[PDB]
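Q: Hi! First time asking for a complex rather than a single chain. Here are the components, and I think there are three in total. Is that enough to go on?
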Amino acid sequence: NAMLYPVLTQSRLLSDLSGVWDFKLDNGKGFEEKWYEKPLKDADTMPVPASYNDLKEGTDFRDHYGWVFYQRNISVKSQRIVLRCAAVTHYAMIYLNGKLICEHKGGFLPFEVELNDDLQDGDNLLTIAVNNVIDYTTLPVGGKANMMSGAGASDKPQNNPNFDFFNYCGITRPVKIYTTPETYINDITVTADIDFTAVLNYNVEIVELFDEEGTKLSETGTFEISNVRLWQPLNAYLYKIKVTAGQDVYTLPYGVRSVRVDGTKFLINEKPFYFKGYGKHEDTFPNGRGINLPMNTKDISIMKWQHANSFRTSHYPYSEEMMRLCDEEGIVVIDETTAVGVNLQFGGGANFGGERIGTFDKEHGVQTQEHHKDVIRDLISRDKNHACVVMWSIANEPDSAAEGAYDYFKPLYDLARELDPQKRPCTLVSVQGTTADTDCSSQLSDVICLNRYYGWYFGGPDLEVSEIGLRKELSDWGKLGKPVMFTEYGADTVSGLHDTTSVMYTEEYQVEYYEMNNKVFDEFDFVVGEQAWNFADFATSQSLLRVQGNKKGLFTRDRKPKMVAHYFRNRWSTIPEFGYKT
Amino acid sequence: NAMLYPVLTQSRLLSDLSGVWDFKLDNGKGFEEKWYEKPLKDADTMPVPASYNDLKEGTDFRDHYGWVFYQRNISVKSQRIVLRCAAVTHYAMIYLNGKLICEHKGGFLPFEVELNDDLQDGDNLLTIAVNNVIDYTTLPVGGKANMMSGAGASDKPQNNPNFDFFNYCGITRPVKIYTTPETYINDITVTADIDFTAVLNYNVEIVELFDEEGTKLSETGTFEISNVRLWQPLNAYLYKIKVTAGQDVYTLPYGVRSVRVDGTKFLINEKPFYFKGYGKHEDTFPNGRGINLPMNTKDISIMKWQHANSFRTSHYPYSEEMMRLCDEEGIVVIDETTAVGVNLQFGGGANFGGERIGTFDKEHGVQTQEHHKDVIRDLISRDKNHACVVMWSIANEPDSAAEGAYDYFKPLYDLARELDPQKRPCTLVSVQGTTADTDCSSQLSDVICLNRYYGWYFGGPDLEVSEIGLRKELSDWGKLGKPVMFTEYGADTVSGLHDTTSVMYTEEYQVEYYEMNNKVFDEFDFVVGEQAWNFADFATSQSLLRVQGNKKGLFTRDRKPKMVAHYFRNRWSTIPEFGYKT
Amino acid sequence: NAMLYPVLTQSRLLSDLSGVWDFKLDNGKGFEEKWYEKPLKDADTMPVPASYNDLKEGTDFRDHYGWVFYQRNISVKSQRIVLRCAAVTHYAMIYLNGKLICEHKGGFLPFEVELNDDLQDGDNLLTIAVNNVIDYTTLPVGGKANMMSGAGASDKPQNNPNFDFFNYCGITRPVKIYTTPETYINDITVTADIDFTAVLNYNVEIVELFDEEGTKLSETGTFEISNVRLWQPLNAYLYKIKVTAGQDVYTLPYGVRSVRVDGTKFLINEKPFYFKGYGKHEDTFPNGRGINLPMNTKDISIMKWQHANSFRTSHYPYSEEMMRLCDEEGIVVIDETTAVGVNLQFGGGANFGGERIGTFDKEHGVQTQEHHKDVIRDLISRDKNHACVVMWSIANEPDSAAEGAYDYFKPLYDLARELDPQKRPCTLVSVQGTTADTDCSSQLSDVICLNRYYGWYFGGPDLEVSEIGLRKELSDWGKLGKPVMFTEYGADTVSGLHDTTSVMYTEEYQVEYYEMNNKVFDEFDFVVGEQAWNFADFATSQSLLRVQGNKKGLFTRDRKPKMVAHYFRNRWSTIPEFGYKT
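A: Yes, that's all I need. Here is the structure of the assembled complex.
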């Protein structure tokens, strides 16, 4: 249930296992050969943490279907030993000296196991198999053909993702080893009540406030009170929390923050906020989905350079190392689960009995609601203590208007409200074609988050006509008395393509696209957020509509800016975080 | 019927009218205002010859629907005066001092008019209106929606071309003024019979051979005979023909050439030929479809640089200035008519009565067969005396497998055979999906010219699977005992996009694409031609599948080479013009 | 003296400190304010390991002059604790709880310190200051103006490097914490003698062979003997060495390899070798000089993709994590020291007394010979047990033909021979203009490694004339009876710049450049190596001659290939590792 971010404490070690491991692609005849027992033979090398897909050469390597084998030797005994894999994508089986230890369905969330039992003296063998297969039982969801069918599924077995990004798999995030005394802290939970005319509830499970610079303060289930400094967007401030328990210490950073909705207003510390930012990705070269601390810190600089404040974990939980990094710098975050691809209208929907299949058919449709719940639990049981997180996104672009939509998301929306000790807003982002009167999110989500492409997929290159449809659909969402946010809107743009009389795919059309849309966003006082799609270019599956990946980014994959990054930087320079609307 | 290329002769003048004219966009209220009478007011400037679409700034200008007005003053009287417009795209009305003189339906072929009658002393006014509307009655054919529908036709009137290139319109080719004595030559026709062990038939209508360097020779309906030097691909040689008649002189260059088919062999002077080249376009910046003598001469250099010999006038007759230029340099040409777009399966076919419309429906389909015939006449009545022309293409990618296909093209195929005093091969290039047993060209065309995209539109990015389909369809065409030529095969490629593990749209995939295809072409001895698509990048209508136009070219629009231009140059260096197959 | 690469063993921990730290730029008033005592205030964030220069926005940040402050909290006691900084660039002062602990001059080599004494119970403070100033007393060497003076040194203080790459500084390589029993292994040294018709000497300081797959074997100052499997380029094989001593274990991988020179032959296991490869850099975005395990493993793939075998640590020792990675994959390495910039002819040489200064003037010249020696010691005392290392490079492009050249490098050449328990070849790479009769390396180095640019800096764009000079200078080096290797030759090339008639900076000129040079290399049987410059594009200081950095790479900075990467891949495909010359 509960995972705490490991760190050097007076009671706990932290031995990182990151490095170059032994690696082998499964050829089917792998598990019967019991490769997990003896050290890998004819093994190649692969760094950890990283996605393997882009680190060796060849289509047969990048597009491999099935299992891969990471191997590594280990050595160390009086303390509780535990092996936390920060993330394995997607499925993982952790052998050790041949004997299985753990399994995990879940590609972008951490899990730990006990280590004292089993284990030996030294020179014992660690093996981790990773599977990449996605289908109707996985999150993210894999289909049975290409997503952009509006290449035939033939011959060789492969993964056909129901999502517009590449299936970067492997040990994406680090593998560490921390220790604990036989009695340990297992979870911390701290809350806040502010008197805007400053008390911190703080349950624990199996304590001293500290202030930013370190000047120690109050001491003590717990509770506190002080004259506090507010955590603000682009103005962070983190108190420290030193938990002293059964001869064990874990330190915790906390920010004082209040989020609630008052109709058409998103309140951050009782002020009228405005989202300025992007949908992002964990996408670099050549790490793929692997973690890249430099690029994380680098994008933060660019975002402050570009006068932003927000972004969304599209379309999966990010790294712990980044969420904390968003606490330090004061970046508003919209956290999101792995629930993308819950939509069987993409491409040609599956056809069991000669007729199309709805998304939530009980027999031939999505079979994810169970695993969907654990993800909501494990995610909120991880990021509950981040002031950067002001909202949860239960899913990206699902069939939120089909039979079964409401009855699918209702229990998930409630589980979200039940487990967040702060009662944060919850939402899902809506596909195009979804209207206010037909969306299961119109009476379920506290804010309306839209993904609309008026002037690109729908209406391009006629920007006059596309503007009419955008206004028509936007006036129709105002009738909910809820806030409306745009989480995706963009236009593919190849860097270096120009013209004075702009056509599609040029840097000039990309600016005119955003000029038209933002001109309409400003006409409505219930729009409390513009989030561009995308922050940077990123890799996808191969298709005719994908020019070496998704070029909708404001920046390139090497983070170099396009002409639109300078448009948004000038625009977002004169738009405040608070009171842009009032 | 007959048009002779004007040139300075002892009897004939030639005053070019090319320059900057007065120009105005029609606003509807134009013909009732009788703008053709008084000189244009509030007029802009436009060079002639050129396509206007790209020479001024603005979508409303580039995408104008309707008429444009060229205006110009003229002045000079004992001779027959005549105004030949080398090409106006598409429809033209030639006023003069307000009084109409001529009209022409036909966008890429010349026409002339008489000038002595009417005309005045000096400072008389010339006005030329040009229309750009295309529909089911035009060649090329315009539809009722975008061509790549596998943007909604809405609100504003526009042209929706049924072809993958831009509707560059205006006075594309020059406007000149030549004079003749009241008795003039109107047509010349010269033929050849070679004894490959050398006689020239030469009718005239209302004469001395001359040899290349100018050493005069035989003299004289006519006839000649000599020990000749053969016109060969990449080895040209043009005799001269000085027609001396009723005090009038017209000089004519001629080449001695023999073309015929002996089963799976294309015979040029009784030798087994092989087409090495491209499908080309009249496409430059910013002239559009306008004539560009430098680029013409420049591409010829590149083609000899790249070790080619052939190309096709895709998809319209080119300039006279280029065809003669192909005679001088020895470039094999496949001449083609304006018949592209005769296919109503593109996009979503029109739907008159709730059900789709076949291409050759008598009531709701193509209405071009009449104008189709005149184009075949006017084209062959123009390019009949070019040794570079070794074949006629009656149409590009038509519905050559639908009801009405045969009965449509049969009279056109015959008119082609009737009017060519050399009995050259005739063909049409076939859409993808057309097979040997279903194509009206399988028993109509003397050679099979295919446009196939195995590995791009159909099968990409799986080059293994795409190879199987290409072999399967190619073995199935061999059973005709006719030669097979590829006139289109390519892959969109953005210059500067690279990867070692190649994906689509990169320069590396483009090479692998051609590597797979050419590997299969060589496996079959009935393939007598590979012609790449395209020679250079060129502009199209705006679509999601068109990244600033058609990037399938080996070169860029400014003629800079891609990595594939160097692949083909190395490949075509070791492939001869003759005997590659035998 | 001796540093062993830390790793999890039965006796030793390894707690990585990599992560996001507190960071502050010195403003002068820093050390007097004793920032090292109290935790940093107004602190920004910076990941470790990384070069800070590119992770925040602004010229004033990227081009900062002076100190930066890394800060971090630490916690843990029965074992010997030690803090090894794998590399700090350039100078480092390691405070802890305010009390200084260590200092290190040396930017690209590791150092460790003792930790038991001092240190506290928990929540004690670690501070690391890093300096970036380079001058005549540093390696690399910093000058007093820009290097490409054939921008005036004015106003603001800055660093003016005497080398063509950027001054990426900071904690480039990781910071870890390992423990040892009070008695520990401090150094291992293993040697080999092969009977080519297989004995391993193995001293230790304060033991069981193991075979690749792990099948244990012989046991035992030591010695061994077996029927061995040879470590070969592109065919690696690493035995394991488990040192069991005073209750302490350290494991060591070893390869059986023999290197010696027999006149014009470089012998690797008594076979005639040929270097196929590049000069490389530790240069990625945005890590700068920071370590990037994915890119390391990625380049190895590309090198095997491109059919290479060798490369050079230009111009500094690389990471331990990469050298071991070169042992696993079988990549020949030419190890190099930080000795670049020992040349005061670059730009305008310094002018103390109105007249130029020679490089090795005792009073106003290079003052590095002392620190130069320690670098040779610390480097060979680190990489002595890598089979990938077949040579040491004492310096890059120094004034190897000026007064003082010989007397400077002589003691360094000897120290190199004294401390390598394998007697590997030693060399330095020579500037252009250096000839055989004038180079202190002509009678000092066992192999002649040249950096020549015939056809670029010297002779471009005339490739005929440049070829004559290259042959003339190459015939003149053959008269030494020593092997000749090219370590640098290239031409700046902007990706995407093309022409059929090639000019400088195009992808075509770059190929013709290498075509001319390699045509001459093959004409001489004493050339035993071609190494391109560079492997990839990389960042430099700003100059008119530097188009966003050094574009001489075969690949781009994001590792995408240029047209020349495919030239070398086809060339190196038919050139073996052995017997290309014989």
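A: Residues 463-478 of chain C form the longest helix (16 residues). Let me know if you'd like any chain examined more closely.
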